[PDB]
Amino acid sequence: ASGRALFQYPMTSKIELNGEINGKKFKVAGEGFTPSSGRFNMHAYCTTGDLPMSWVVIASPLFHMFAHYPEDITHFFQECFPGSYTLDRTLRMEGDGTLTTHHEYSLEDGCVTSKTTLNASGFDPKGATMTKSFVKQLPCEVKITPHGPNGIRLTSTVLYLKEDGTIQIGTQDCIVTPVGGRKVTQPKAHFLHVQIIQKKDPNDTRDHIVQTELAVAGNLWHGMDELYK
Ligand SMILES: [Cl-]
Ligand SMILES: [Cl-]
Questions:
Q1: Domains of the chain (ranges, CATH numbers)
Q2: By C-alpha distance, which of 27, 21, 28, 24 is closest to 42?
Q3: Angle 122-209-42 (CA atoms, 0-180°, nearest 5)?
Q4: What sign results for the dihedral spanned by CA atoms 13, 16, 20, 24?
Q5: Could you tell me the maximum CA-CA distance found in the chain, to the nearest angstrom?
Q6: DSSP string spanning 136-164?
Q7: I want to staple 30 with a disulfide (CB 3.0 to 4.6 A). Which of 7, 44, 86, 176 is the partner?
Q8: Centroid of ligand 2 to alpha carbon of 185 (angstroms)
Q9: How far away, in angstroms, is 56 Cα from ligand 1 center?
Q10: 91 in helix, strand or coil?
Q11: Ligand 1 centre and the CA of 62: distance in Å?
Q12: Ligand nearest the Cα atom of residue 209
C-alpha cells in the first residue's frame, strides 16, 4: 500500500510547531480532521501563552498531502509515502520581514503528524505581522514545478488583508524533498488552488485558531510544463 492508497478518508492530523520571531520563542500544538479529499482542518493553539504573531501569517505554516488531485496529475506529496518528505518554506512579508519553516511528516493510524520549526528575524515591530492587524489571506494559486532530480517547488504571491481593508503582499516559495531513499516520479507543472479560512472556537480558553483549508490541483495553464525540464 503506497501513494494514494494510503490516503483513504477520513483521516486526522497533529502538529507540533516550535517557533521564534524577533527573539520571542513560542510553541503551537494542534489536532485536525480531514473529512474528504481536499478539505482539511486544524484546531491549533499556542501552549506557551499568547501567540506573538498573526495567526493569519502562521496559517500557511499550519499539509499538502491532503490536497485533492485529479487522477491524471501525479500527487507527489502522497506518492512520497511510504518514506515521507520534508518541506522547506520561505515567506517574505514585503516591507515587513521574512520567515522560514521546516516541516517533517509521519503517517500512522490514519493520522499525519507535522513537526515544524519556524524562524523569523527582523520583523517590523509595528508591522501587521507583529501587531496582529491581519484579518485573512485571500485565496491563491500555487505554481508547482519539478525541481532537481527528485524534488518539487511551490511558489505563490499572497494578498494579506489588514483590518483597514488594504493589502500587504507575501511572497512564498517551498521546496519539497522526498526523504524515503527512493525516486518519486515528478508531476508535470501544474497549479493548486488554496483557500484558507479561520475562525475561533466558541469556548476555548487558549490563544488558538480553527482553520480550514481547501486545496485543489488543476492543470490551469497547459503550456507551463513545456518550460520545466
Ligand atoms: Cl491574529
Ligand atoms: Cl503529472
A1: 1-229 (2.40.155.10)
A2: 28
A3: 105
A4: positive
A5: 51
A6: EE--EEEEEEEETTTEEEEEEEEEEEETT
A7: 44
A8: 8
A9: 6
A10: strand
A11: 14
A12: 1
